[PDB]
Specification:
46% of the residues lie in helices and 10% in strands. It has 449 residues and is of the alpha+beta class. The structure holds protoporphyrin IX containing FE and the ligand O[C@@](Cn1cnnn1)(c1ccc(F)cc1F)C(F)(F)c1ccc(-c2ccc(OCC(F)(F)F)cc2)cn1. It is classed as oxidoreductase.
């Protein structure tokens, strides 16, 4: 009934906060290499943090119920973003229902309009921003704009996109977002109630009231039948809890924020990496192979084109998430003892499973730093870029749609070149990890026939 060994702590209260904050990949690896155990504990803020660094053992982390292993305590930090009693802040039965309602809004049934809607906004953005035959842009920054744009198009009804537009909205997000401090989960007391938080306060409330407005409007056009609007907001209003109740404005607001917040960063980063590797000259063959798959498409693309007819592109995307998972760490609060291989993990520990670590296990992913889209996880379940089990990603399919879609539209109507020797080094200093902002400059060369 014993622990994984604990890495030596040079200074107790810090634990390993420094070498962790500086390069968590190198660090966690060494812990692994020296400890010689995939599974090991580290001290951060004097907090037992046991990382599951063995691909075989993932099922352990993901399979267990929240009651046994709970996200909530860990993920409190979102609550201001999402709201009181929204998602994790909410009781698990409810949070589940909410997540489900959302998940339904993101099934492939809804996707019918999306590919065209997304392609439109990308072509808009390009023409307004890539006006010249050549030119230089920040790829991470542009992609960010393309994502929030194409998303709103995808999940926002006309009227809502009238009162509220993508660029502004992005601004609102970042405003609520700037509020976050990552340290906080492990040490939640730092969250107990913080300067811009008010902005998240105001950022959110502003949004909320806009909607509260929007709703009143759409209620009084059912009489007409004027529009049958089934955008994300639509669905959420038509949802009913089991107990027969409905979602209060706040919960609706929370769930839309959460939806948009997640995709925005995770997706824009994914897009960016993916393009980068492809652009790079070493990756010619892959770039060429990409083409062999999208050259023979009509300019206007449909659903069949993207899911069923771009297997490979999707490989590039997944490989990109494999090499540099946007979310380094997933976590639970061990609320009861759990077996993990030959070890046990004590109620009260903090238990994590790191895509970042796992994606660089050699058994599973030899030479991980190599971006090889045609590589296949050597150990089943190794890849966890979208997590697994109960709490696996719901946005996964929609995201793949957008990134895949964006890749096709951009590359089809453009070429590209990295303004550097080598693909950008990730920047581990952000809550969600993306390539380093300053190096994401590149030259766009238009194409013509
Ligand atoms: C590259 C794109 C994405 C990546 C890499 C990604 C990654 C992940 C990962 C690793 C998890 C596991 C969370 C955990 O175990 O703590 C997860 C969960 C989740 N993701 Fe994503 N995600 C992506 C896109 C999206 C998008 C676009 C949305 C919403 C639009 C979304 C919504 C969620 C939600 C709601 C969960 C919680 C699942 C649950 O707790 O049941 N994701 N995602
Ligand atoms: O899991 C998220 C993020 N996500 C997942 N897919 N897309 N986005 C999430 C959860 C539910 C949602 F509805 C929307 C979300 F975006 C989340 F809850 F907010 C979430 C939880 C924890 C973290 C997170 C936790 C700890 C972190 O520590 C940084 C470190 F790894 F230590 F370097 C960094 C990030 C990020 N996002």
């Amino acid at each position: 009934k014993k622990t994984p060994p604990v890495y030596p702590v040079t200074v107790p209260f810090l634990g390993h906060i420094v070498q962790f904050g500086k390069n968590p990949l190198e660090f966690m690896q060494r812990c692994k290499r020296d400890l010689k155990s995939g599974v090991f504990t580290i001290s951060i803020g004097g907090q037992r943090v046991t990382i599951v660094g063995d691909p075989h053992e993932h099922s352990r982390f993901f399979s267990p119920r929240n009651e046994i292993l709970s996200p909530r305590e860990v993920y409190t930090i979102m609550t201001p973003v999402f709201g009181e009693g929204v998602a994790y802040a909410a009781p698990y039965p409810r949070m589940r229902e909410q997540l489900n309602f959302l998940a339904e809004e993101l099934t492939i049934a809804k996707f019918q309009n999306f590919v065209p809607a997304i392609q439109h906004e990308v072509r808009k953005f390009m023409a307004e921003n890539w006006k010249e035959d050549e030119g230089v842009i920040n790829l991470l920054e542009d992609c960010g704009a393309m994502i929030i744009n194409t998303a709103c198009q995808c999940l926002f009804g006309e009227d809502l996109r009238k009162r509220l537009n993508a660029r502004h909205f992005a601004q609102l997000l970042s405003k609520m977002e700037s509020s976050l401090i990552p340290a906080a989960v492990f040490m939640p007391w730092l969250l107990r109630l913080l300067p811009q938080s008010a902005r998240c306060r105001e950022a959110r409330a502003e949004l909320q009231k806009i909607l509260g407005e929007i709703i009143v409007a759409r209620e009084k056009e059912e009489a007409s039948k004027d529009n049958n609007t089934s955008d994300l907001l639509g669905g959420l209003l038509k949802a009913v809890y089991r107990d027969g109740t409905r979602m209060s404005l706040h919960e609706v607001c929370g769930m839309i924020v959460a939806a948009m917040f997640a995709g925005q960063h995770t997706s824009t980063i994914t897009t960016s990496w993916s393009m980068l590797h492809l652009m790079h000259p070493k990756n010619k063959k892959w770039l060429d192979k990409l083409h062999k798959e999208i050259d023979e498409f009509p300019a206007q693309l449909n659903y069949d084109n993207v899911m069923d007819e771009m297997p490979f592109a999707e490989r590039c995307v997944r490989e990109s998430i494999r090499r540099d998972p946007p979310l380094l760490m997933v976590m639970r609060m061990v609320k009861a003892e759990v077996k993990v291989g030959s070890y046990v993990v004590p109620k009260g520990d903090i238990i994590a499973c790191s895509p970042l670590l796992s994606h660089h296990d050699e058994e599973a992913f030899p030479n991980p730093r190599l971006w090889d889209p045609e590589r296949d996880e050597k150990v089943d379940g190794a890849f966890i870029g979208f997590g697994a089990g109960v709490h696996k990603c719901i946005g996964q399919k929609f995201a793949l749609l957008q990134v895949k879609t964006i890749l096709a539209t951009a590359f089809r109507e453009y070429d590209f070149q990295l303004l550097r020797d080598e693909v950008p080094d990730p920047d581990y200093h952000t809550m969600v990890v993306g390539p380093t902002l300053n190096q994401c400059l590149v030259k766009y060369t238009r194409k013509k026939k």
